[PDB]
């Protein structure tokens, strides 16, 4: 029933499209190193690369964690296409995770033989953090998620966190906190044991995957004039003059609604664009301040568009930039446009303001008979009553959710990188190898530092349920679809290479179907 | 109950003849290599051996498959004799497969010791493809079936397929598809686990195993004349003259029914036949065209006979040619008539037209007082209303079934090589070794490439049910039977050799009993 | 089915209305290709859903006043098929042709059912003329069936180029094709009611 | 059926495994016949269960930049069938062929 | 109820995608000439454009007819796209026609 020669799970990887629901099942194989050699280590940094915003104080743990938070973990490229071409929206309903077929392997080294055997009596520890009492590291856009491609085996990331540091240095504060993860009740698993967990997502709005089919400022009827008048000019006396707003003149018409917030970020020309030679580009990025340090915010807040339709100019600090292939840890290499997957928000340009231009102008003075009217442009503007914008699009390579920070107050909790802001997101699932001491022949009151070196492996299946929003549209002519289109392909995209390396050439977002404002 | 020291199956190899049913049970031992080292590799080829029909694009998988599709897998030589001598027909009713007694063996190499141990915690994955969503590679006449002889242990073949390639080159198309086999739900099996599957064949016609006891054109009564008249000649004036059709003159009589379709293939003289010296023979074979390439079709379509009774002349491109013994992969050696098992269709010669002769003649002109009548022979003719033929015979060494390709339309879906055309054939049963990573001490976001090398072995039993058609005949004199007949045998045929190598000297087909048209 | 077709197979379109389909007419002084619309009752040029039945060409012979040719032996030039190394005359042909074309004198005579107006003694080697014979005509099927003594059509024999012009050639035989429609041999008061389908593996359209 | 086939009709065999079937390759200096094994992904040489649909040959013409031929009347060289002593163009052909070959 | 000032139908033009079914409704406005001036006329042709396959004999009638037989009559370009991108096949199940709001 439960033992060494009986499998504790099966491989469920699949998708089931039923009505407005869809359930996606994905199973992967993982391997867990024994991190720190069963130690909690205090990690810290001072200012590096000329910035004291890189200073931190924190801890690294023996534990490791499961990260479900990228879309390609749950979705096939063909299932993502079926979703984005056919639907106006989706949101996650529920989640359940299972960890099974555990294998603990003891490794030994004598004169460089390095033999490996399996320890049938050894245990692994697993707990889920249901009450959100640990620092939540998942939604921050870091590596270690289940692979995009099911055959791939992956290592679990090491768990660690940064607490408060003092005066932008590597030293701690009195409010720097240490969290022991052994002080949670956890479940201990041998080979025949398995683990199961179930979670229900809180109510969130649908991700709206459509593009606006109208301009925000062109919403008026082009055939009929307005009954509203505008101040045109003033005669040779100071007397003021008025004209009627006519038909399709959209510069002059009255508006109910206004674009979303903005801040200006530098545009850079990809491809044939000429740009400028030998820029260092760190000093001129947009920044914010905390605690006397200056941080780059590489996504900006929502309400802008990084690219304007078919132009070469991108903001690059308003963009999500991906690599076409995974990289080694700590790679300082320089990459070009061809190596990069550079997303475009230009499907939102009707309702959103371009990031590399000014946002408008306002009056800078009071006129008189003596002085003429004057204006000036503004490079930043924030939330205004009657504003409408679109949120950052979601990509198959991008994050599903984020956790809203726990403080007093927040506004419109939509993550800048993308996805769903969640007060109670899917909990963190943490796992470690239980230590097995080496040969100890004596009593000592100092803790045991000599352990059998070992690692564990197994399978994990995740099952998510998604709610779908049907596309109900009276558009007569055909729409834009995500299609598989390449001229003289030397390989097929989203498939293994001749070596076995899985290749993804281009990013895929959700906004294709079009809808009127 | 379910564990390491309890066997999960028994050896069932047997046959039970009951009425019109017969059930054949056969168990074998298999071994499964770990293919590609757990990788999906893109395989491709350009034009080789001077033919761009050999170019392809496709994928090879870590998986391997069970292939039940030759008759000697299910049938003994004595049970095949009891079948073909006593019955007019058979068709498969049902099938059930079981995979049990799984053993996973870890192999390690230190300074060329190459030790082998068994990993009791390791798993194997098995799924059946019920919905026919994968490329179906089974019915195509390729190696890797269960052996003919029960003591033999066999390796499972590696699964792979070819998709669309572009312009008869090795490059892909936009419609080239990649199928991940991890994206099916599969069942994971440790040592104590087993797998079971059941299948019911769809309704097909009986394979008709009998020979015609009459000629197609001799069906008339030789004693009585016809009441029908033929145009014999014309007198010194153009006036036309007629004669009566008399008694047993079968050249001249009217016919209701006509032979099956034909195409002409080159005849070659086996044995003492003189043939012709130093022919390359590739340029003069029959071919068909697809996509701008020219393919040999080494079986032809049904409706011809390759050999005419006791002549030495064979078509050899209308023939199924077997080896008396298995061969190594990729063997370029040249073989002679003695090494080969060369089948003859000559039992069908009454109803089927010989492949190496013309099929007839037709009028090539309009006569007149000035011009005389003219005809010419045709080398090919296709399906005609009122045609009757016999399908390719089945052999103990040959395929049981094929899958009808999924397209719009098809005609008379009988496989050219033989057996039963099936819209939903027995599903493919695919199996792989689950990967066990090696020692990984660090986190990396690139997939794990280092694995424990291991293989698995076990037993598989297949149970098929067959429906039989009784032979009901009023023939007075004895018939032809398949008999075991050899003059001065130095060994017994269909038995092991002095070395242990199983020997089959001659092919055995189903058509012995005779029946009138 | 005892009726005759009241329409031609290729004339099924409405003669009053044009097709919305276009045909390749020609090419200009450059190799550029040109198209025209299919108009109203032009039935040579219109698109077709359905096609005539199978054929093979058999020699036509002129009954009555037709002149024919003198002193033909006529056995060597009949249509034949092969079995087992022998060559047989098939005096009916397969279905899907018409032996006579309406009121013409020309008959195929190897596509025809020929009867005697009176019974004969067994083993009679006598020669008979047209007047002694009952010679059936299938011409009521001529709208849907192809005449046996003519070619059945033509197809392209080459690939063109700037250097070479398009070429075709006629074919004397054609077999079952997807979307074919024909009529079966008619039954006569003097003829057979039924036949037995031979017992083999396979058969097609057992008429 | 609105889908396209994802495989070639003649490429249905497994490219990894050889066939257990042999082909007549040649004949030696005596008339004796010789045989070779069908290997792996050689799809020119392999045995086939299934065959393409029916055909008849119709003249190909080059659209776009294709050079073609000058001043063709093109009625006399079309494919035709006969009924009742007349010769008709059948501007669609019967099913079982493809008019264009991919990006040509 | 039934008279000159009461409409005998409504405009139904729409499509409803439900499961494996889809129903397409389309309404059009037609005009009917009086053909032949209420006569049956015998129409015929000899060989024209050098082909005797163009010869025919037939009749033209005062009548006219409704023809539903092209796909774009029943389908939008956006509904055709939703069909061909998402499905492996289709066949017609049923049909119903209505003729209303007659004006002479």
PDB file of N, CA, C and O in Angstrom, chain B residues 292-349:
ATOM      1  N   UNK B 292       6.708  16.505 -55.593  1.00  0.00           N
ATOM      2  CA  UNK B 292       7.883  16.668 -56.418  1.00  0.00           C
ATOM      3  C   UNK B 292       8.974  15.647 -56.200  1.00  0.00           C
ATOM      4  O   UNK B 292      10.092  15.849 -56.677  1.00  0.00           O
ATOM      5  N   UNK B 293       8.685  14.556 -55.495  1.00  0.00           N
ATOM      6  CA  UNK B 293       9.630  13.471 -55.289  1.00  0.00           C
ATOM      7  C   UNK B 293       9.029  12.182 -55.820  1.00  0.00           C
ATOM      8  O   UNK B 293       7.816  12.074 -55.994  1.00  0.00           O
ATOM      9  N   UNK B 294       9.890  11.203 -56.071  1.00  0.00           N
ATOM     10  CA  UNK B 294       9.510   9.964 -56.732  1.00  0.00           C
ATOM     11  C   UNK B 294       9.864   8.789 -55.830  1.00  0.00           C
ATOM     12  O   UNK B 294      11.040   8.557 -55.538  1.00  0.00           O
ATOM     13  N   UNK B 295       8.847   8.056 -55.396  1.00  0.00           N
ATOM     14  CA  UNK B 295       8.971   6.995 -54.410  1.00  0.00           C
ATOM     15  C   UNK B 295       8.730   5.649 -55.068  1.00  0.00           C
ATOM     16  O   UNK B 295       7.841   5.510 -55.902  1.00  0.00           O
ATOM     17  N   UNK B 296       9.506   4.649 -54.670  1.00  0.00           N
ATOM     18  CA  UNK B 296       9.211   3.265 -55.008  1.00  0.00           C
ATOM     19  C   UNK B 296       8.102   2.774 -54.097  1.00  0.00           C
ATOM     20  O   UNK B 296       8.147   3.004 -52.887  1.00  0.00           O
ATOM     21  N   UNK B 297       7.118   2.090 -54.667  1.00  0.00           N
ATOM     22  CA  UNK B 297       6.131   1.410 -53.840  1.00  0.00           C
ATOM     23  C   UNK B 297       6.392  -0.090 -53.971  1.00  0.00           C
ATOM     24  O   UNK B 297       5.973  -0.725 -54.948  1.00  0.00           O
ATOM     25  N   UNK B 298       7.090  -0.687 -53.011  1.00  0.00           N
ATOM     26  CA  UNK B 298       7.607  -2.037 -53.183  1.00  0.00           C
ATOM     27  C   UNK B 298       6.547  -3.116 -53.072  1.00  0.00           C
ATOM     28  O   UNK B 298       6.755  -4.214 -53.602  1.00  0.00           O
ATOM     29  N   UNK B 299       5.463  -2.929 -52.302  1.00  0.00           N
ATOM     30  CA  UNK B 299       4.271  -3.730 -52.593  1.00  0.00           C
ATOM     31  C   UNK B 299       3.481  -2.996 -53.655  1.00  0.00           C
ATOM     32  O   UNK B 299       3.578  -1.767 -53.737  1.00  0.00           O
ATOM     33  N   UNK B 300       2.713  -3.671 -54.457  1.00  0.00           N
ATOM     34  CA  UNK B 300       1.912  -2.838 -55.331  1.00  0.00           C
ATOM     35  C   UNK B 300       0.514  -2.793 -54.728  1.00  0.00           C
ATOM     36  O   UNK B 300       0.301  -3.363 -53.653  1.00  0.00           O
ATOM     37  N   UNK B 301      -0.449  -2.110 -55.335  1.00  0.00           N
ATOM     38  CA  UNK B 301      -1.834  -2.255 -54.881  1.00  0.00           C
ATOM     39  C   UNK B 301      -2.364  -3.666 -55.109  1.00  0.00           C
ATOM     40  O   UNK B 301      -1.817  -4.456 -55.882  1.00  0.00           O
ATOM     41  N   UNK B 302      -3.455  -3.977 -54.413  1.00  0.00           N
ATOM     42  CA  UNK B 302      -4.050  -5.303 -54.499  1.00  0.00           C
ATOM     43  C   UNK B 302      -4.729  -5.518 -55.850  1.00  0.00           C
ATOM     44  O   UNK B 302      -5.084  -4.575 -56.557  1.00  0.00           O
ATOM     45  N   UNK B 303      -4.931  -6.786 -56.188  1.00  0.00           N
ATOM     46  CA  UNK B 303      -5.526  -7.163 -57.450  1.00  0.00           C
ATOM     47  C   UNK B 303      -4.605  -7.744 -58.496  1.00  0.00           C
ATOM     48  O   UNK B 303      -5.016  -7.854 -59.653  1.00  0.00           O
ATOM     49  N   UNK B 304      -3.384  -8.128 -58.134  1.00  0.00           N
ATOM     50  CA  UNK B 304      -2.470  -8.801 -59.044  1.00  0.00           C
ATOM     51  C   UNK B 304      -1.861 -10.022 -58.373  1.00  0.00           C
ATOM     52  O   UNK B 304      -1.982 -10.218 -57.165  1.00  0.00           O
ATOM     53  N   UNK B 305      -1.203 -10.850 -59.178  1.00  0.00           N
ATOM     54  CA  UNK B 305      -0.457 -12.004 -58.687  1.00  0.00           C
ATOM     55  C   UNK B 305       0.988 -11.874 -59.152  1.00  0.00           C
ATOM     56  O   UNK B 305       1.247 -11.563 -60.316  1.00  0.00           O
ATOM     57  N   UNK B 306       1.928 -12.064 -58.225  1.00  0.00           N
ATOM     58  CA  UNK B 306       3.339 -11.834 -58.521  1.00  0.00           C
ATOM     59  C   UNK B 306       3.949 -12.995 -59.289  1.00  0.00           C
ATOM     60  O   UNK B 306       4.786 -12.795 -60.173  1.00  0.00           O
ATOM     61  N   UNK B 307       3.555 -14.213 -58.955  1.00  0.00           N
ATOM     62  CA  UNK B 307       4.062 -15.417 -59.584  1.00  0.00           C
ATOM     63  C   UNK B 307       2.916 -16.069 -60.335  1.00  0.00           C
ATOM     64  O   UNK B 307       1.766 -15.988 -59.900  1.00  0.00           O
ATOM     65  N   UNK B 308       3.222 -16.708 -61.457  1.00  0.00           N
ATOM     66  CA  UNK B 308       2.221 -17.506 -62.148  1.00  0.00           C
ATOM     67  C   UNK B 308       2.597 -18.962 -61.906  1.00  0.00           C
ATOM     68  O   UNK B 308       3.500 -19.506 -62.534  1.00  0.00           O
ATOM     69  N   UNK B 309       1.874 -19.585 -60.979  1.00  0.00           N
ATOM     70  CA  UNK B 309       1.934 -21.011 -60.611  1.00  0.00           C
ATOM     71  C   UNK B 309       3.393 -21.469 -60.565  1.00  0.00           C
ATOM     72  O   UNK B 309       4.187 -20.882 -59.817  1.00  0.00           O
ATOM     73  N   UNK B 310       3.784 -22.500 -61.323  1.00  0.00           N
ATOM     74  CA  UNK B 310       5.094 -23.097 -61.133  1.00  0.00           C
ATOM     75  C   UNK B 310       6.182 -22.485 -61.992  1.00  0.00           C
ATOM     76  O   UNK B 310       7.208 -23.120 -62.241  1.00  0.00           O
ATOM     77  N   UNK B 311       5.976 -21.260 -62.469  1.00  0.00           N
ATOM     78  CA  UNK B 311       7.018 -20.574 -63.216  1.00  0.00           C
ATOM     79  C   UNK B 311       8.088 -20.042 -62.273  1.00  0.00           C
ATOM     80  O   UNK B 311       7.865 -19.904 -61.069  1.00  0.00           O
ATOM     81  N   UNK B 312       9.268 -19.766 -62.831  1.00  0.00           N
ATOM     82  CA  UNK B 312      10.346 -19.155 -62.065  1.00  0.00           C
ATOM     83  C   UNK B 312      10.224 -17.642 -61.989  1.00  0.00           C
ATOM     84  O   UNK B 312      10.913 -17.022 -61.177  1.00  0.00           O
ATOM     85  N   UNK B 313       9.368 -17.039 -62.807  1.00  0.00           N
ATOM     86  CA  UNK B 313       9.316 -15.590 -62.914  1.00  0.00           C
ATOM     87  C   UNK B 313       8.511 -14.992 -61.769  1.00  0.00           C
ATOM     88  O   UNK B 313       7.369 -15.384 -61.528  1.00  0.00           O
ATOM     89  N   UNK B 314       9.118 -14.043 -61.064  1.00  0.00           N
ATOM     90  CA  UNK B 314       8.484 -13.281 -60.000  1.00  0.00           C
ATOM     91  C   UNK B 314       8.572 -11.805 -60.334  1.00  0.00           C
ATOM     92  O   UNK B 314       9.472 -11.379 -61.057  1.00  0.00           O
ATOM     93  N   UNK B 315       7.645 -11.022 -59.792  1.00  0.00           N
ATOM     94  CA  UNK B 315       7.669  -9.585 -60.021  1.00  0.00           C
ATOM     95  C   UNK B 315       8.685  -8.892 -59.116  1.00  0.00           C
ATOM     96  O   UNK B 315       9.326  -7.914 -59.520  1.00  0.00           O
ATOM     97  N   UNK B 316       8.818  -9.370 -57.880  1.00  0.00           N
ATOM     98  CA  UNK B 316       9.783  -8.945 -56.864  1.00  0.00           C
ATOM     99  C   UNK B 316       9.520  -7.542 -56.342  1.00  0.00           C
ATOM    100  O   UNK B 316       9.937  -7.210 -55.230  1.00  0.00           O
ATOM    101  N   UNK B 317       8.815  -6.722 -57.110  1.00  0.00           N
ATOM    102  CA  UNK B 317       8.248  -5.481 -56.616  1.00  0.00           C
ATOM    103  C   UNK B 317       6.763  -5.598 -56.334  1.00  0.00           C
ATOM    104  O   UNK B 317       6.143  -4.605 -55.960  1.00  0.00           O
ATOM    105  N   UNK B 318       6.162  -6.750 -56.615  1.00  0.00           N
ATOM    106  CA  UNK B 318       4.826  -7.099 -56.158  1.00  0.00           C
ATOM    107  C   UNK B 318       4.873  -8.064 -54.975  1.00  0.00           C
ATOM    108  O   UNK B 318       3.825  -8.493 -54.490  1.00  0.00           O
ATOM    109  N   UNK B 319       6.064  -8.422 -54.502  1.00  0.00           N
ATOM    110  CA  UNK B 319       6.260  -9.497 -53.540  1.00  0.00           C
ATOM    111  C   UNK B 319       6.582  -8.937 -52.164  1.00  0.00           C
ATOM    112  O   UNK B 319       7.135  -7.844 -52.027  1.00  0.00           O
ATOM    113  N   UNK B 320       6.208  -9.701 -51.144  1.00  0.00           N
ATOM    114  CA  UNK B 320       6.689  -9.520 -49.780  1.00  0.00           C
ATOM    115  C   UNK B 320       7.918 -10.402 -49.598  1.00  0.00           C
ATOM    116  O   UNK B 320       7.828 -11.623 -49.739  1.00  0.00           O
ATOM    117  N   UNK B 321       9.061  -9.796 -49.296  1.00  0.00           N
ATOM    118  CA  UNK B 321      10.323 -10.519 -49.182  1.00  0.00           C
ATOM    119  C   UNK B 321      10.807 -10.429 -47.743  1.00  0.00           C
ATOM    120  O   UNK B 321      10.954  -9.332 -47.198  1.00  0.00           O
ATOM    121  N   UNK B 322      11.069 -11.583 -47.140  1.00  0.00           N
ATOM    122  CA  UNK B 322      11.477 -11.697 -45.750  1.00  0.00           C
ATOM    123  C   UNK B 322      12.863 -12.319 -45.684  1.00  0.00           C
ATOM    124  O   UNK B 322      13.349 -12.911 -46.647  1.00  0.00           O
ATOM    125  N   UNK B 323      13.503 -12.168 -44.534  1.00  0.00           N
ATOM    126  CA  UNK B 323      14.778 -12.805 -44.249  1.00  0.00           C
ATOM    127  C   UNK B 323      14.522 -14.023 -43.375  1.00  0.00           C
ATOM    128  O   UNK B 323      13.640 -14.002 -42.512  1.00  0.00           O
ATOM    129  N   UNK B 324      15.283 -15.092 -43.604  1.00  0.00           N
ATOM    130  CA  UNK B 324      15.090 -16.297 -42.808  1.00  0.00           C
ATOM    131  C   UNK B 324      15.569 -16.109 -41.373  1.00  0.00           C
ATOM    132  O   UNK B 324      15.258 -16.930 -40.505  1.00  0.00           O
ATOM    133  N   UNK B 325      16.311 -15.046 -41.107  1.00  0.00           N
ATOM    134  CA  UNK B 325      16.871 -14.737 -39.803  1.00  0.00           C
ATOM    135  C   UNK B 325      16.928 -13.231 -39.603  1.00  0.00           C
ATOM    136  O   UNK B 325      17.020 -12.474 -40.573  1.00  0.00           O
ATOM    137  N   UNK B 326      16.863 -12.762 -38.359  1.00  0.00           N
ATOM    138  CA  UNK B 326      16.959 -11.319 -38.117  1.00  0.00           C
ATOM    139  C   UNK B 326      18.352 -10.790 -38.421  1.00  0.00           C
ATOM    140  O   UNK B 326      19.336 -11.530 -38.480  1.00  0.00           O
ATOM    141  N   UNK B 327      18.425  -9.478 -38.618  1.00  0.00           N
ATOM    142  CA  UNK B 327      19.650  -8.824 -39.043  1.00  0.00           C
ATOM    143  C   UNK B 327      19.992  -7.690 -38.089  1.00  0.00           C
ATOM    144  O   UNK B 327      19.150  -7.218 -37.322  1.00  0.00           O
ATOM    145  N   UNK B 328      21.250  -7.263 -38.141  1.00  0.00           N
ATOM    146  CA  UNK B 328      21.684  -6.129 -37.347  1.00  0.00           C
ATOM    147  C   UNK B 328      21.157  -4.831 -37.950  1.00  0.00           C
ATOM    148  O   UNK B 328      20.881  -4.761 -39.149  1.00  0.00           O
ATOM    149  N   UNK B 329      20.992  -3.790 -37.137  1.00  0.00           N
ATOM    150  CA  UNK B 329      20.514  -2.513 -37.672  1.00  0.00           C
ATOM    151  C   UNK B 329      21.523  -1.891 -38.624  1.00  0.00           C
ATOM    152  O   UNK B 329      22.723  -1.843 -38.352  1.00  0.00           O
ATOM    153  N   UNK B 330      21.019  -1.416 -39.757  1.00  0.00           N
ATOM    154  CA  UNK B 330      21.865  -0.735 -40.720  1.00  0.00           C
ATOM    155  C   UNK B 330      22.787  -1.649 -41.496  1.00  0.00           C
ATOM    156  O   UNK B 330      23.947  -1.294 -41.736  1.00  0.00           O
ATOM    157  N   UNK B 331      22.300  -2.815 -41.905  1.00  0.00           N
ATOM    158  CA  UNK B 331      23.116  -3.778 -42.632  1.00  0.00           C
ATOM    159  C   UNK B 331      22.996  -3.530 -44.131  1.00  0.00           C
ATOM    160  O   UNK B 331      21.902  -3.592 -44.700  1.00  0.00           O
ATOM    161  N   UNK B 332      24.122  -3.212 -44.760  1.00  0.00           N
ATOM    162  CA  UNK B 332      24.185  -2.917 -46.183  1.00  0.00           C
ATOM    163  C   UNK B 332      24.575  -4.129 -47.017  1.00  0.00           C
ATOM    164  O   UNK B 332      24.802  -3.993 -48.221  1.00  0.00           O
ATOM    165  N   UNK B 333      24.674  -5.301 -46.398  1.00  0.00           N
ATOM    166  CA  UNK B 333      25.073  -6.513 -47.096  1.00  0.00           C
ATOM    167  C   UNK B 333      24.082  -6.881 -48.193  1.00  0.00           C
ATOM    168  O   UNK B 333      22.898  -6.538 -48.140  1.00  0.00           O
ATOM    169  N   UNK B 334      24.591  -7.588 -49.200  1.00  0.00           N
ATOM    170  CA  UNK B 334      23.799  -8.091 -50.313  1.00  0.00           C
ATOM    171  C   UNK B 334      23.424  -9.544 -50.055  1.00  0.00           C
ATOM    172  O   UNK B 334      24.250 -10.328 -49.579  1.00  0.00           O
ATOM    173  N   UNK B 335      22.183  -9.895 -50.372  1.00  0.00           N
ATOM    174  CA  UNK B 335      21.619 -11.205 -50.100  1.00  0.00           C
ATOM    175  C   UNK B 335      21.235 -11.884 -51.404  1.00  0.00           C
ATOM    176  O   UNK B 335      20.972 -11.217 -52.405  1.00  0.00           O
ATOM    177  N   UNK B 336      21.223 -13.212 -51.392  1.00  0.00           N
ATOM    178  CA  UNK B 336      20.844 -13.995 -52.556  1.00  0.00           C
ATOM    179  C   UNK B 336      19.478 -14.642 -52.337  1.00  0.00           C
ATOM    180  O   UNK B 336      18.834 -14.453 -51.306  1.00  0.00           O
ATOM    181  N   UNK B 337      19.025 -15.418 -53.325  1.00  0.00           N
ATOM    182  CA  UNK B 337      17.718 -16.065 -53.223  1.00  0.00           C
ATOM    183  C   UNK B 337      17.654 -17.015 -52.034  1.00  0.00           C
ATOM    184  O   UNK B 337      16.593 -17.184 -51.425  1.00  0.00           O
ATOM    185  N   UNK B 338      18.770 -17.663 -51.701  1.00  0.00           N
ATOM    186  CA  UNK B 338      18.746 -18.660 -50.645  1.00  0.00           C
ATOM    187  C   UNK B 338      18.557 -18.060 -49.266  1.00  0.00           C
ATOM    188  O   UNK B 338      18.000 -18.699 -48.371  1.00  0.00           O
ATOM    189  N   UNK B 339      19.014 -16.823 -49.075  1.00  0.00           N
ATOM    190  CA  UNK B 339      18.869 -16.171 -47.780  1.00  0.00           C
ATOM    191  C   UNK B 339      17.447 -15.669 -47.570  1.00  0.00           C
ATOM    192  O   UNK B 339      17.050 -15.356 -46.444  1.00  0.00           O
ATOM    193  N   UNK B 340      16.663 -15.609 -48.639  1.00  0.00           N
ATOM    194  CA  UNK B 340      15.419 -14.860 -48.633  1.00  0.00           C
ATOM    195  C   UNK B 340      14.210 -15.777 -48.560  1.00  0.00           C
ATOM    196  O   UNK B 340      14.211 -16.889 -49.087  1.00  0.00           O
ATOM    197  N   UNK B 341      13.164 -15.290 -47.899  1.00  0.00           N
ATOM    198  CA  UNK B 341      11.842 -15.907 -47.916  1.00  0.00           C
ATOM    199  C   UNK B 341      10.963 -15.096 -48.857  1.00  0.00           C
ATOM    200  O   UNK B 341      10.540 -13.990 -48.519  1.00  0.00           O
ATOM    201  N   UNK B 342      10.665 -15.657 -50.020  1.00  0.00           N
ATOM    202  CA  UNK B 342      10.007 -14.942 -51.105  1.00  0.00           C
ATOM    203  C   UNK B 342       8.627 -15.549 -51.303  1.00  0.00           C
ATOM    204  O   UNK B 342       8.502 -16.711 -51.707  1.00  0.00           O
ATOM    205  N   UNK B 343       7.594 -14.771 -51.000  1.00  0.00           N
ATOM    206  CA  UNK B 343       6.226 -15.257 -51.014  1.00  0.00           C
ATOM    207  C   UNK B 343       5.669 -15.281 -52.434  1.00  0.00           C
ATOM    208  O   UNK B 343       6.097 -14.536 -53.314  1.00  0.00           O
ATOM    209  N   UNK B 344       4.689 -16.153 -52.646  1.00  0.00           N
ATOM    210  CA  UNK B 344       4.013 -16.291 -53.925  1.00  0.00           C
ATOM    211  C   UNK B 344       2.512 -16.128 -53.732  1.00  0.00           C
ATOM    212  O   UNK B 344       1.930 -16.707 -52.813  1.00  0.00           O
ATOM    213  N   UNK B 345       1.896 -15.313 -54.585  1.00  0.00           N
ATOM    214  CA  UNK B 345       0.457 -15.082 -54.578  1.00  0.00           C
ATOM    215  C   UNK B 345      -0.281 -15.973 -55.569  1.00  0.00           C
ATOM    216  O   UNK B 345      -1.465 -15.756 -55.818  1.00  0.00           O
ATOM    217  N   UNK B 346       0.409 -16.947 -56.164  1.00  0.00           N
ATOM    218  CA  UNK B 346      -0.120 -17.690 -57.304  1.00  0.00           C
ATOM    219  C   UNK B 346      -1.402 -18.452 -57.001  1.00  0.00           C
ATOM    220  O   UNK B 346      -2.060 -18.912 -57.936  1.00  0.00           O
ATOM    221  N   UNK B 347      -1.776 -18.617 -55.735  1.00  0.00           N
ATOM    222  CA  UNK B 347      -3.054 -19.259 -55.455  1.00  0.00           C
ATOM    223  C   UNK B 347      -4.225 -18.382 -55.873  1.00  0.00           C
ATOM    224  O   UNK B 347      -5.354 -18.872 -55.955  1.00  0.00           O
ATOM    225  N   UNK B 348      -3.977 -17.103 -56.143  1.00  0.00           N
ATOM    226  CA  UNK B 348      -4.986 -16.156 -56.598  1.00  0.00           C
ATOM    227  C   UNK B 348      -5.020 -15.990 -58.107  1.00  0.00           C
ATOM    228  O   UNK B 348      -5.805 -15.179 -58.599  1.00  0.00           O
ATOM    229  N   UNK B 349      -4.201 -16.731 -58.848  1.00  0.00           N
ATOM    230  CA  UNK B 349      -4.105 -16.510 -60.285  1.00  0.00           C
ATOM    231  C   UNK B 349      -5.414 -16.691 -61.053  1.00  0.00           C
ATOM    232  O   UNK B 349      -5.549 -16.044 -62.106  1.00  0.00           O
TER     233      UNK B 349
END
